Amino acid sequence: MVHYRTIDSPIGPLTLAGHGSVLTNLRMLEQTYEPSRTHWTPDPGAFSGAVDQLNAYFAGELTEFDVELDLRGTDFQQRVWKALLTIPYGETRSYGEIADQIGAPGAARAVGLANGHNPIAIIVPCHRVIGASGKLTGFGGGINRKRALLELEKSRAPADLTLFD
């Protein structure tokens, strides 16, 4: 029995969910049909490790996530979601690049589709893929959320100013 906890964030209410200390979900779930959520047990308590990290990512301090993930979906989806994890904070790839990486040259359009079913939204960074055109995808508010996340990372001040002295 999945337990979930919704928290607040600059891109809106982010619902977190899974069994115990492993994540299965992370979306902003408001204003779309999400019947799976009714089958879940609320829990203001769990996932607080990840809630900390989320707060810090938005604060601009965190760059890398340490979190347990159980990613479920088709085999193709997992290879795609696994490759998304290999994208560094504040970088991008093309759907074409991801297809090459997971060994399926030409599946750019298949990677776009897999991307939109990413069950864990910030920690698995689907926002960091963008096509040649440079146009953002995602459904409705999803686009503005993505842009937000992209402007966030791109903006982060260098960590150690002492390298300048």
Query: 47 is written with which tokens?
Result: 């996932």
Which residue in 81, 152, 89 sits closest to 111, CA to CA?
81
Which residues have C-beta within 8 Å of that of residue 4, sequence separation ≥ 6? 15, 16, 17, 18, 25, 37, 40, 41, 42, 43
Half-sphere exposure of residue 128: CA atoms within 13 angstroms, side-chain side: 23
* CA distances for 21 relative to 35, 42, 50, angstroms: 23, 14, 9
Which residue in 38, 140, 37 sits closest to 26, CA to CA?
37
56 is catalytic: no
Classify 140 in phi/psi space as left (phi over 0), alpha (psi -120 to 50) or beta.
left
Q: What domains lie within the chain, and their CATH numbers? A: 1-70 (3.30.160.70), 71-156 (1.10.10.10)
Alpha-carbon distance 69 to 58, whole Å? 20
At 146, phi and psi to the nearest 5? -55, -45
What kind of experiment solved this structure? X-ray
Rounded to the nearest 10 degrees, how much is the dihedral formed by the CA atoms of 53, 58, 60, 64? 40
Q: Strand pairing partners for 4?
A: 17, 42
Give the position of tokens 């991307």.
115
Measured N-to-C along each axis, helices 108-115 and 75-85 cross at an angle, to the nearest 10 degrees, of 90
Which residue in 65, 81, 157 sits closest to 113, CA to CA?
81
Alpha-carbon distance 115 to 2, whole Å? 23
Cβ count near 116 (within 10 Å)? 11
Alpha-carbon distance 2 to 17, whole Å? 6
> Å resolution of this model?
2.6
Beta strands at 22-23 and 68-69: parallel, antiparallel or unpaired: parallel
Give the active site residue among 50, 126, 149, 152. Answer: 126
